[model samples]
Each structure stands twice: as structure tokens, then as C-alpha cells.
Target: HHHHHHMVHITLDRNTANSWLIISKDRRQVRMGDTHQNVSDNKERFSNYPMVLGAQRFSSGKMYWEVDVTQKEAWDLGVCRDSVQRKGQFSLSPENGFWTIWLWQDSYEAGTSPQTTLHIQVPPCQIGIFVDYEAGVVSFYNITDHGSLIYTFSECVFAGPLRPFFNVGFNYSGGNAAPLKLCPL
Candidate 1:
């Protein structure tokens, strides 16, 4: 019974980005941007869905966030349930509301169910997200092993706010051009 660690600072809800993804003007970095800034096919913009969400909304306490996904070839980080379906392609697992964890091509996925296969001996430039909306718990961290434990999504039963999700996979070539950064934690 020793649970005590709380620090939350999330950002990247550029209306749920995906107009080619590069959001870092103090919006706490999210990358895929080299130029293609014609945003807005609105309805919370995951238009064609690459993904992004978390500008605050989590009814209850204990939340955390981090992401660097160093040299990413693809990406995904978790949490969703502000009603979770922004459009088309779903099933990111967690029964559709998503509870992600990924880094494709280089392989390492954990949205589990049949996909569950996560083994990282050393490939985590940074990634940590801890949530406990009243103990429904949600966890992920590799963070250079300082934040260790790489997966947890137990009972996440919250009937309210819980947004803080991201996805960096649409691959405009060159190993995803490195940028899944939202770490001020």
C-alpha cells in the first residue's frame, strides 16, 4: 500500500491534430512537421486519423505524462475516453476507447488482446504516462528505466474525463522523422 507519485502536465490537443502533425510552438512538441499546414477538416481534426488529444480533462486525480519516442519510426501513446471515436479506423484496443503503447516497424506493441508483445531491452528514449482516475489505473514508462514499468491498464473504469492520447503514424518516410515529444515531466 504505497502509492504516491503525482505530476501532470499534458498538452497536444491541437483540436486533435493530424494535419501532418508538427505541433511545437510551446504546445509541448509533437512531430512530423516539415510543412503541410492546412489544418481543419474539423470535428476534432483526426481527419484520416494520425492522432492527438489532451488539452486537459480528467475527472479525478493522479495523472502524468511524458513522451520522446526517440528516432521514432512510428508512434502511439495512451488514454482516451472523452467519448473516444473521432472518426473512421478504430480498435486501438481498450475496447475502442484506446489505451495505447507502440513504436511500429522497429516493433513493440502493447494495446493488448492479441497484440500483446512488448519486450524492450533498450529502446526507449523516453515515454511515461501514469494515470489513476480514482484507481482505475493506467501506466506506461520506460523512461530510461528511471520510470521503468512498461505497461498497465487495469480497470480504467471512469465515467468521466480521461483524455491524453497521441499517435504519430502516417509515415511520411525517413523513419517517421522523429517527433513525438510532449515531455515537460
Candidate 2:
């Protein structure tokens, strides 16, 4: 079916990543660093959130990327506009230009305005994010569960480019130190 051909190889952008996040040399993996790096803060870098953005930006075409979130106790994955806030504190929601789903503690929740709660019987080990920019739709899939649908954001209004977003969560005394690995489709 040539399913792999359409999937995009998403890479993390170091420029937008928080200093507490350690991006792999290949840019395909990101984890919460134990200590903050001695790096200068900037407008693109996230000052308060432990999040990172992808290098690829979508303006028209549909694209998909899978991330291996196994062994991660807390993490956030989805897409956000290029103009999303990078400084101070802000919630992850469409109103804030972020459409994401996050796993916190033993619960899974979508980054909706009110934060929709998702009751997933089998927590997803790998998450597949597909964004149809023209269609104004963003869908998340549980790749480890036969690619079942997890959540979808419809009628999205995109003012500009949309980039993939990730938050590896906290280190949690090494309990949540596992990196978020981008899969090669």
C-alpha cells in the first residue's frame, strides 16, 4: 500500500527546544536532561516548558510521523503553530495554537480547552500523528494498537505553518528519563 512513502521523518529542532531537553545528534530523539545546559535563551527557545518543536513545517499537504513513547511516564505529542508562545507559562490547547495529547501519571488527556480525558485500555507505546493542513484536521493514532484512532481535532484554523511539538516531561528522579524517539515509519 506504500504506507511508508507518505510518512515524514520528523526531526527535532534544537533552536526551539528548552535547555533542559537534550536532543540527539540525529535530531530524532529527545529526552529530559538531568541538568540544564549552559545555553543562551532566545525567542524561539521554550523558557518555561520542557518542550521541543520539529524542523518540518506544513502549510498545505498532509503529513504523518510516528514517535516511540515507550517507557515514558509523562509526555506530550502533537502539532502547533509556528507562532505559539515560547516564553513563560501557557496551556496546550487549540486556543493557544497547540493541538496535543499528553500522558500524565496514569491518565491520558487531549490538549483541548477543557482537556478531554481519554480512557485508553491499552496505553499507546507509539503515537502516530497525521496532520491534514488543508482539511483542517489533526489526528492521533495508537500505532502499537493496530493504528487505531486516538483523538482528532477538526476544523482547525491555521494562520501559518504547523510544526510537530513534543514534551518529554520531567526526569522524575530517573523514572521518566526515557527519550522520545521518532520512528522511521
Q: What is the C-alpha lDDT of each candidate?
A: 0.77, 0.88
On a 0 to 100 scale, what is the lDDT of residue 104 in model 1? 78
Candidate 2 stretches with Cα past 4 Å from truth are: 1-5
**Lowest summed lDDT window (length 10), candidate 1:** 1-10
Off by over 4 Å in 1: 1-15, 22-30, 37-40, 46-51, 54-68, 71-124, 135-142, 146-159, 166-177, 181-185
Task: Put down candidate 1 lDDT per residue, 16-135, tens digits, no spaces.
Answer: 787777788788877666666787667777767578887888888787777787777888888888887787776688777677888777888888665787888878898878888887
Candidate 2 clashes between residue pairs 3 or more apart in a chain or in different chains: none
Q: What digit string (tens of lDDT, one per residue) describes model 2 on residues 1-185? A: 12345699888999999998889899999988778877788889988878999998889887888999998899999999999999999999899999899999789999998999986778899988888888899888888888888899999987889999999998755789999999975
Clashing pairs in 1: none
